[PDB]
Structure formats: C-alpha cells, structure tokens
Design a protein around this ligand. Structure first.
Ligand SMILES: [Cl-]
Ligand SMILES: [N]
Ligand SMILES: [N]
Ligand SMILES: [N]
Ligand SMILES: [Pt+2]
Ligand SMILES: [Pt+2]
Ligand SMILES: [Pt+2]
Ligand SMILES: [Pt+2]
Ligand SMILES: [Pt+2]
Ligand SMILES: [Pt+2]
Length: 119
C-alpha cells in the first residue's frame, strides 16, 4: 500500500563513511529479496527536493514530459554493487558528488515519484 511518493522518499531521500551504502541499502529494504544493483541518495531537505517539480522541465528517459532538472547541484551518494557482490551478502561502493538531479513529478501535491538521473 506504499504510494509512489512514499517509495521515492524510502529509496532516494536521506535528509539526516565507506560503509554508508552497505548500511543504507539494508535499512531502506533494498537488499531484501535481491541486491538492488544501483541507487542514488539525495542529501538535501525534503522541501528542496520537492521544489525541483517547479524547476527546469525536461523529457524523462521513457519519453514522458513530467521530468524536472534541479537548477542547483545537490549533495548525492551513488551506491553501486561491486563486481564480486552476491546475495544475501550484498556489497556496495559509496561515491559522493554534487550534481543536478532529474526527477519525474506526479499527483497532488505534485511531488517526485521517480529518480530519472543525476547530471
Ligand atoms: Cl511511475
Ligand atoms: N550548477
Ligand atoms: N553526501
Ligand atoms: N525511482
Ligand atoms: Pt551527504
Ligand atoms: Pt549527508
Ligand atoms: Pt551545474
Ligand atoms: Pt516511476
Ligand atoms: Pt528509485
Ligand atoms: Pt526507473
């Protein structure tokens, strides 16, 4: 019964080390049945990420036009499973950057529902 907006917050928001991704991928239920291979966390306020839905309108990867690019760079952590990672012992490399995010927005209130990319 999780909404698309709630799922985006669970997978992609960290509004709060080398082991960050190992710990975060676990606590967000992204290693439950399989190791989710790639995931990005946004290290910004929920308000600042929701505001992206009023910024630069762009096409999404899938061809819809409800995508938005952040005008500002944001603090993000990229998590990517190692070559040698095997479930249920899921292993991630943690990479920090300052990049624009692209999100899909839907619904009322009009908030992020899908992490399209970082640029
Ligand atoms: Cl969707
Ligand atoms: N930027
Ligand atoms: N971060
Ligand atoms: N997403
Ligand atoms: Pt951070
Ligand atoms: Pt952080
Ligand atoms: Pt930029
Ligand atoms: Pt989606
Ligand atoms: Pt996602
Ligand atoms: Pt997707």
């Amino acid at each position: 019964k999780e909404t698309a907006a709630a799922k985006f917050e669970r997978q992609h928001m960290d509004s709060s080390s080398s082991n960050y991704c190992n710990q975060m991928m676990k606590s967000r239920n992204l290693t439950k049945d399989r190791c989710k291979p790639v995931n990005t966390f946004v290290h910004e306020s929920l308000a600042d990420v929701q505001a992206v839905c009023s910024q630069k309108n762009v096409a999404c990867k899938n061809g819809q036009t409800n995508c938005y690019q952040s005008y500002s760079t944001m603090s993000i952590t990229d998590c990517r499973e190692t070559g040698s990672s095997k479930y249920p012992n899921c292993a991630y490399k943690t990479t920090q950057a300052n990049k624009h995010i692209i999100v899909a927005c839907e619904g009322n209130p009009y908030v992020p529902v899908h992490f399209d990319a970082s640029v």
